[PDB]
Structures are given as structure tokens and as C-alpha cells.
Subunit: 200 residues, 8 copies
């Protein structure tokens, strides 16, 4: 009988934000609510001026109570581009099992849910039709990569990734801005696609 | 309550077949195709008269070419019962993250896809609408459990599980027939629900 | 039969001093004896100006000979506050096994002895009714956390904790003054209670 | 002598039942309730005719509802004998840290709570003064010993221990009946005391 | 396509004898020398009637002094068949790095030296053109596989392999006679080629 | 029977470039093509001004399309010197198994292929008689040394090695320019030979 | 030759009794004291009819009080033979570091104390010139071998060794009687010397 | 039978030079030979101005050829002081197994050979009555401590020790000059004796 021995394949992990999409949930939330503190907390988090979990929970705090519909509607701004799909299809062609990860909400990044072979993000807590908080489903992206510790890992990411994710990977590629731990920096998604297309 | 620290929770792994459903894809394939050899191969696999992967791939071979529609028709025999739903909801109340697994096809077990916190099974290969083979997405259920090695695990399963899976669990419960390595044996899903309801 | 599977629960470790109580044994000893060197050695230890074990043993040296009664009477100044109890009860509610730790004396922190699910501190050596020295019952708080290496750990602490304790934890919260390794800083016990109350 | 480096000492673990006391809670429960099934379940557990946890939880089930007073009355049958006290004091003289363990209830084994340097057993759940179930505070005695994995262990035990516990020990002594994995068998507690007195 | 990330690929290990060739050096040595004891020692080794290394070194002893020319003449009986070449080329197409191993001599198995991506076997010691002994370049085939412990392994082998080698493999295939630890048994090299051709 | 227990021997790893030869493929390529960017990228890589993999792939990019013959002809400039051979023969004399490694092409460093006991370098991809790219056969020299993790390692290297390789070694010797992690610096190959000759 | 890198060498461990000497301390004690029970206990230990430590301590008990002079007189029966010396010297020539071990007394095996590169055995306790007991300086011979876990080990031994010791060895040789776990069996010390002389 | 379970005891490792003795072999060699370079190389080594192995081998180089008698006579300047003996006897009293280590020559430090329970130093190579070189018997003192990794370690040392040794220890005490990694600094041997005398 025919088999695709997927479990034995080198793994390609893609951190979605800043690689596959430029949609940024917290910037959208800042825009929607008019609360600039949201975006400022985001910048403090990205820069390392405050601890990541701290800025994250403060942002969650700032949108507590917002309508579930307003929240879920942000999904309408998320799309899988032909280029994003091209990256993923090509990785499969080149023999990778593809895993998409994000620290944002599965509810919002839903369009990516079946794109790769596995998908993982955080989730949202709704009560009586209002957003209440976040389900933290992995500690950080570094820890999440431990799921694939028995094999090799190519990791691709951008501004929402950090050195913790990259030092778990056997090869790491940053997209658009250098990330400590990454072996390569490519200038944009198109260039990442070109690199992968060159594989074999 | 703006935060569910899901990543830190003890894991409740449920092997779907023989716990949540009595649907058995290969017995159904034997019925539909009339190929008794399929069910015989299953019996040989389950009893350990032949190696499991050997038996599985031989079964896969015997349904090569079967139409995707015939294949997908079987999901009509797969339903989330009130009891199965109560098990999973109660597990969450009792502070578990719930992971549903199977060595059968995700496409057929689709009704369970969103019931737990995580879902994992094998997948099917279709070419021009006809079944070509299996995508093996984990080596075996014990190997899969290594995904949750950093915390504690309660495993529940039935006839499609074995000692390898239960060896990984901190506490294991078999349903309906003793399984080597399980700590406990409950009579049926009802008894299992009652047991979980007694927790804490 | 009903069970609380306590052994499988994520662990909440609380460093008592500066989280649950502001009683500080060595400052009390300085006050009682009039020996300011005691408190100066404490400051040198906390600041890292001298190695921790060194300043500790020097402090022990300075109270050698003090009456066992005078020593044990300091317990009268220690109380479990409603807020401290609230923190611990709420952690249990949210599914944690609670472990209280301190590098101070079990004899003095006795009121906390049965508050959590486990309790660990150092002990005192008395001979002929006088204090002679210290029983060091764990190397440091980092090493002590190894007891719980098979599961997840939330750690909470203040001025008597350090980076060694926090890097062993999966999530760390400092109270009242930043501690390297901690993910979050809350301003006081009340705020820590509020954070935990928000869990699930 | 202002310092006892207890954390560095070899560990003497004593399984309480059948070494320090001949009190057997479940045999007493069978006597008090008249439910012979309780003792039969114990015998089945001890002989391995049924899985240990299966047997334990069935026993727990059979005393659901029993009054806390009836439960606590049994501690009257638990006493620290001169010999048991001599064992523990001599172990300390011989340079061991002493850890007393049991799979029975801390509430009943209270007389031993402060005898050793550390004490660990399971706990009981009472609701409105009536027994509801067991808090399992460690998976089994072997798993518990992992707490002391960084040093050496001498284990002493009797009928309620097994190979799992002794496999963890650097040297194991059984009392009164051979236990798989123990290096030595002594006739009774007196012989054990004599053996320890011969050390160094 | 300016890059083949070979180091990241799943490894296909082939034990040469009984998979790619039916040449058996020791049976040939028995034929050439007329020393039946050589083949008897082989049979005793293969059946486990005597320890493998004991048997191997006894065989080595029995050909001490044999001319290098006689030794090298045997490579004339070793040829890369179209089928053997197809196996290796197809494995590469299917995304494997191919490692050929044998416990026999590299000097005799020279035709296979460049067929795979890596090649490993034992070597011969010649002094003044006469055979003196064996260079053992790995302990056994299982130990050798530790070289590829950081990724996944598909192992293929026949009569000169054993459980030790297959225990190391994530998936193992035996050819022509069942081998303990192999998942699958294929009839002959043709069947093996067909199996690999079915991958992905 | 006589044996050379090679598998049990301490391992001597030699990074070829700058120890055994001063031939530098990328400088030769710069010379041949007239493309100074090649050599500049090399300097940026060696100095750590760009990530190693990044400068490597950029260099590969710059010679894509070059005639396979021009490429392979560079081998004519590579020779095993008497001194290089002396180093290797002496290491064997002193009881080492010798492993030669390089990040350059096996096709070009071919003259060294059978010098040591094992040989490993990267390889070249040719299509229609033109160079297309590189096969990366190990992640870096540090990772490659993991192959020999079960024994002791003496490592010798120069300008194409780095701290990653040396911290895997039990003793490290740099040749001609200091390398972080190296225990010793010798001034040239002759001096390295002298050091090894002094062993035992 | 100003340097012997001894720490890097493969280790040759020799269990003294039954390889280098046929002196058996306990059989001699049985002869001198006339206590047949001593030799019977030895036989029971060697055959595994009783646990080894149990048997050893019972033998130790039976010679309590024996004069140090009587004890030391036995070293007259322990001599380094020309063959034993040749084994050790040849092992060094062949590039091994030589470690001599025994579970018997260093005081009696004193003639071997400086023969190897390292020497380890148990020791005796004398009080006022009379034998009081044994100092157990390692748990068992397998545990002792963990000392050399960072390199390779060739183990040689006879009747006082077991599978535990040989399991630790990369290659094991028994002398005079098969021992579980040994790869090879040689007839006597002469054969062993001849085997080692054949190395490299 | 009586036993001293030495193998189970916490280990006290003493780096001899600068704790037990102020004899400094290389300073004596400088004095004897008049070669000031010897002492300068020593200072460069101690200060970290040159790599330790490098300065060591250069010093060895500078005394190559010196009379074996002149070399061995330096032993006459080495004595076990009452204070040194007091330290060691007291450590045994307080339940430690005592291990003495040095990077100097066993031949010269011979008077310490039987002081502790184990002794380890480097050794000298003599040929035709002249010093030829050094046998390096352990990599460094940190690596040597791995021998005792299964238990706890108290380490004491001075100027010839470094952070590598101390970070392997559970408690570290420096004597006379601070050493990175040490918990405590005592001013001289007398004070170290006083500290140990205070133990229990």
C-alpha cells in the first residue's frame, strides 16, 4: 500500500505574522478602538522594553468587553495570498512537513488553518457575546518547537519571532528585519519563495 | 477571567475508536467492498499475529482506487454522542486539556475535529478523486504522546490502543476490554464519564 | 472511587517572604539584638555584594547563643493574612498544587506550615536551650524546584528570590520589585490575587 | 556546630507500613465496616491479581460516606514505638536524612508526621464530615523517589512496597517478607535497627 | 536549484548483504579455502548459537595469511544490479539521504562505495600482501545508526541484520526472511523497489 | 583472530583548510572568474560581518553556471604534501582514528579522500555540464563532531574553523591564527607535526 | 615524547579475580577459620541463589574479630605473575589505560596496587587490630564503570563479574567460564594475553 | 555484617595546592634550574594571559632532560601538616568521602597519596633517568569531578583551581583568594578546618 511517511519529514515552521501576512491584530484593535495605548504596548513588547507576557496581557486587558462580532470580523481582513500559498506548496514539493504558528488568535488567522500540515495559535475566550481573555496554548514559539525535537527544523519568521524560536531550528530565515539566531535574512516573502524554489 | 493558561494543564488524551465511537473504518470497508481479507488483516493486526504497519499497509492496498465519495460516506456513521460530548466537557471542567487521537482518517473522523482542544489522526491521499494511500502522520500513539512529555498525561483508550501508548501515560484507563499498561478498566463510555465526574 | 489527582497538577510555588508576609526574620533579629551588622550583612547578601551563603552563615554566626525562647517567640509576629490565604485558596480553585518555600526557619514561619499542599524551609539547631546554627535543607530555591521537574511550574516571589528560581519556572511573577527571570511584575499581593482570580 | 548541610546527605527512605507499624488501614476498615470485599480487594492488589490503582480506588469507593470521626479513630492504633524511634534516630547518627513515606493517609499516620526529616503520604477528602475520596499525592513510591534523584538512597520497606520503589534505591532492605528488587531481607524491625547500628 | 539541504533529510540505511547483493564473503572464503569450519562458524553466528564477535574473529583467524589477490578476486562476484541502482536512485527521489552499510569488507564491497550518499563497512589488514586481520570500524549496526540519531531513519536489511539495528530505525523493512524488530517484510529486492516507488 | 578495534579509538579531527593545505577554493574562484565580490563575501564571512550560511550561499550564487570542467580542474591545484601525510600517519601511530573534514567540495579536495580513516565535505550539484549549487552535508563542523560523541576528540583546525567546532573537542589545537575554544596555538603544520610526534 | 594524553585513551578494565590471580579470599577464610558456611555463602552468592550483598555481608559477619595479621597473611597468596604483568604491559602498548578492579579487599590485593594505571577495590575496617567490617567503595562493578562513561571500554573478567559489568563494556572478554554479557570467552590468562598481543 | 557505605557518601574534593600545602612545584623548578621563564609561564597561566594547557606544556618543555633524581627529590619538601590531616580527618567525621586532586605530579605529592579516600594527580614520564614529559590523567578539575556526578560534592580549592571545578560542586569554598564559582572564601586552612569542625 502507498504511503506518505509524513512523520519522518524535516519540518518547516512558519511564524505567520510578517511572513505570510502583514495583518497585525493588535494594530487593527488600536485602530478600531481608538486606544493608542494598545499599539504603544505592542511596541514596548516588540522592542523588549517590557516583558512579552506583560505587554500581551495588558493589551488583552484593554480590549476586554469588546463585542465578539467586532473581534471576529477582523478575520475579514485576513487572506491567504497566492504568494503565501506558493511558499507552502513549494515547501511540500521540497519534502517538508509544514507547520504554521502564531501567538495571535486562531479565530482571526482562521483562513490559514488548513494551509499547512499543522496549525497552532492562541485562542479567544468569549462570554455572553463579549471578549473576556486569551487562552495561551504554548509558552512561546521556542517551546512550541520542542514538539518537533526528534527531527530537523527549518524555521521562517519575522517581527513577532525572536531568538528563542530560532535557536531551536537547524536553519533559520528571517524576513524583512534581522532576528537574532537566524542564519539568513531575505528581504520579503517573494525572496523567501525564491530561496525555497531553489531547494534540492 | 481574562486568561486560560492552557499550555500548563495536564493532558487528557483520548484514543477515539472504542471510547467515543464504535465506528470501525476498516470493518466498514470490508462490508462495502465485500473484501473479507480487509477485516481478516485487521484481526491479525489487533491480535499481533502480524506486525501492525504490515497489516495496515496491506489494508490500505486493498482499497486503492475507491472513490472519495464512498470513502467520505462513512463519516455519516460517525457522530458525537451526548455522552462523548459530556466526557470532553467534564474533562475540561476537571482541569484537563483534551487531545483526541486516532490512527484512522481525519477525513472520516471529522465530526470530532473541533470537540477537543487538539485533534490528530492520519490522512488520506486522493488523486483524481480516487484513494491512493495513507499519510502516516505519527509513528504510533506512544510516539505521538512524546508531544506532551513536559507535563502529565491521563490516557483513555480501547481496542486500537496498546501498551506503547499507555506506557507514556501517568494514568491510563481502558474501556471495554483490558489493555496492557492501562491502570484501570471501565465497562463502557458511561462508566468513564462517571469516573471523570468523580474527579477533584 | 473519587480522586483528586494532585500529583498530576501544575505546581504553584510561592516564596513566602515578600509575597505572603513582610515579616523579615533577620531584620527582627537585628532589632532584638541591637546588632546592626546583622542587617548590613542582609543588605550585602540581597544586593549580591557578597555571596549569599557567605552572608547567611555570617548572620547565623552573629545570633549563635541566643535563647531558644527569644528565637521561637518571633513566630508571634507571623500571621497568615486573609489576603495570603485568599491567594492560596484561589490557586487551588484554579487547579494548582500549592507549594510554599522559604530560606528562613520553619520554626518561625510555622503558621504557614499547613496553608499550601507542601511546605519547605530551613530549620534551626538548638542545644541546651540556645540557638547553635542552621540546617540547610535545600541548596537554593532553583534547586528545590527540581522536585517538580516532571510538570509545569508557576512561581511567585519577591526580594528573597532570584533569577535561579525563576528560570526553572514556566511562568514567573515578581511582587513589588523586579526580579530577573520573572515574566510579570505585580505591585503587591492584592494584585497577585487579582491576577490569579482572573485565571481559566 | 552552626551548620547541618542536610541537603547534601544520603537519603534513608522508610515505607512506614510493615516496617515501623503493623497497622493496616484497609484491614481495619474491613473490620469496622464488616465489608469483607475491602480486604479481598487489598489481597488482590498486594498479590497483583488486579492492578494496584484499580484495587485502591475500589476500596476508596467502599468507604465513601464514612464519618471523619470513625476514620480518625484509627490513629489510636498507630503509635511510634521505642524501636521505630530508635531506627530513625540511629539513621540520623549514621548520617542519613530520613524520609518517611506511605500510600496510606497522612491523617491516620499523623503520629509519624514529625518523626523523620520529611514526611509524605496520600490525603483524604472530607465533605461535611464524611469521607468522599482520596487525594493521590504521588503516582507510586518509585515515582516519589525521583524527588531524591540527585543523591544516593537507602530504601527500607515491607509488604506495601514493590520492585518499582527498590529499583530507585542504591541499596534496599525488605522487612519480614522478600520484596523483588531489595538487596537484603531482615527478619523484623529489631533486626533492621541492629543492621543500621552496625553502619560506619 | 542551487542548494540540496542533505544534512536535514531522513536517512535511508541499507544493510548491503541480502538486500543489494547475494554475495556472501564468508561462504566464498569457505569455498575457496575448502575450510568448512568457516561456513559453520557463520551459521553458528547467524543463528546466535555463539556470540557474534566470537564467531567473526574465529572466521578472521581461519583466513590469516590468505593473499590479497585471492581476497580481492571476490569483488568480481559483487555487482551493482539495475534493481539495486533503482532502489538507491528512487530513495533519493523520495527525499532520503542514502547510507549503505555492511559488517563485511569495504575492499570487497567496493562496487557499492559511491552508490549511496554515505558508505560504511569494516576494513582488512594486509601485511606484505597477506591478510592479517580485521579493522572493526563500528561496534555493531545498531551502534552505527547512532550517527543519525538527530533525525528519522528508515532501515532496510536482511540476514546479516538483527533487532539491534532495527530498534534504532523509525521504520524497518526486512527482505526475504523475517528479522526481529522490522516492521515490514518484503519478498525480494524487486518488491522493495516497488514499495519505495509507492512513497509520497 | 587479529583486530584493530578502530571504533574504540580517540578521534583526531582535522579541518583540512589551513592545516593540511593552503589552497582556498573561493579565492581561486575569485581569481578564475575575476569576480572580486567572491573574495569580499569570503572575508565578510570569516570575520563574522555576515552570517556564515548567508555569505556561503551568496558565493555559490556568484559561480552558478560555470563550466563543470573549470570547476573540477581546481583539483589539479590540490596536493597531499609529505608534511600533511606525516601528520596523519603519525596520528595513527599515536593511536588516533583520523577524520578529515571541510566545508568545501569533496570533488576538489578529492586528493585527501582516502588519507584519513574517514572523510567528509560538502558536494557540488552539476546539471548539463554547469555548476548549479551546493549539497550541504552537515550543518557546521560543531554538529558534525556529534558523530563522535561517544568517545574523546582531538580537533585541529585553522581559519575555516570556529568556536563551535572546538568546544565539542576534548583538546583543540589551532594552526597559524588563534581560534576561540582552542587550547593550543601552533605556528604552522610543521609545528603541529612536532607536537603529535611528541605524543605517548 | 613529552606528553601522554592518558585521559583520552580507551579503558581496559580488568576484574582481578579469575583473570590475574586464582586467589579467592573467602575460600581462604573458610579454610583458615574452618567455617564451611563462609564458602557455602560464596557459592550461593555466585550462583544467584541469594542476593549478592546479602551473601557478602553474611560472610563479612562470619569473620568479625579475626586478627589483622591473619587477614594480611593472605596477601602472601597473591602474586603478580609474569603473565599478569605481560597482559597489563601489552594493553598499554596497544593504547589502553588499564584499570584493575575487585570487590575484594585492597589490603589483600596490594600486590596489584601499582600494576595498572588505576586501582579500585573495597577496604577493611579494623578496630584494635581486629576485623570489624567492610567499606563498600562502589555499589557493584557495573556502577563503578560509569566512572569511564565518557569513553570506550574493554572489560575482562571471570567468575566474580556479571552481566551488569559487561553491559557497560563496549567489548567484553570472559576468562575460563562464560559470563552473561561478555562478547568473547578465552580459555585462560595465556589465551587472553595472546588475544591482546594480536591487537592493532 | 558491619558496613561503611562509603559509595553513598557526599564527596569532599580538595585541590591540594594552596589548601593543604604551599609547596609549588613549578616555582621550585624555577628556583632549582634558575630558569625564570618557568615562573613567568606559570603566572601567565594563572592569570589567564595564556591558555592553561599551553603554559603547562611550555613549562614541561623547559625541564625536559632534568635528572630523575633532582625531580623526585622535590618530594622531600612536601609534608602533610597536622592541620592538613586535621581537615581530612574531620571531613570523615562529618560523613564525607574525601578525594584529593592536583594537576601536579603524583610522584612529588606522594606524601598525600593515602591521606584521603581517593587520590588523583598527573604523572611524570622518565626515560634513561631523565624527565621527558607529563602524563595528563584528567582533562581539568571540572571534568574530573564528573566521576562523582551521582552524588553531592563539596569542593575546596585555591589558586590552582578555577570556575570549572567550582560549578560542578554543590558547595564550594575558596582558600585565601577568591575563585569564581566558589560560595565561600575562607582566609586560610585553619579557618577552613574551623568551618568543617562546625558541621552537623
Amino acid at each position: 500500500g502507498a504511503m506518505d511517511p509524513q512523520f519522518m519529514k524535516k519540518v518547516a515552521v512558519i511564524d505567520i505574522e510578517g511572513t505570510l501576512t502583514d495583518f497585525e491584530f493588535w494594530r487593527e484593535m488600536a485602530r478600531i478602538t481608538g486606544k493608542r495605548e494598545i499599539e504603544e504596548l505592542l511596541e514596548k513588547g516588540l522592542s523588549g522594553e517590557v516583558e512579552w507576557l506583560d505587554s500581551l496581557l495588558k493589551r488583552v486587558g484593554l480590549i476586554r468587553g469588546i463585542d465578539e462580532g467586532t473581534f471576529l470580523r477582523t478575520r475579514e481582513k485576513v487572506n491567504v495570498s497566492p504568494e503565501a500559498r506558493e511558499l507552502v506548496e513549494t515547501l511540500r514539493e521540497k519534502g517538508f512537513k509544514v507547520v504554521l504558528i502564531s501567538g495571535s488568535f486562531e479565530e482571526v488567522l482562521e483562513p490559514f488553518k488548513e494551509l499547512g500540515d499543522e496549525f497552532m495559535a492562541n485562542r479567544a475566550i468569549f462570554e455572553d457575546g463579549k471578549f473576556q481573555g486569551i487562552r495561551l496554548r504554548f509558552r512561546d514559539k521556542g517551546e512550541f518547537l520542542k514538539r518537533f525535537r526528534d527531527g530537523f527544523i527549518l524555521a521562517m519568521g519575522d517581527g513577532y519571532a525572536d531568538a528563542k524560536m530560532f535557536e531551536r531550528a537547524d536553519m533559520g530565515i528571517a524576513v524583512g528585519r534581522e532576528i537574532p539566531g537566524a542564519d539568513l535574512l531575505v528581504k520579503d516573502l517573494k525572496e523567501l519563495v525564491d530561496f525555497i524554489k531553489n531547494l534540492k
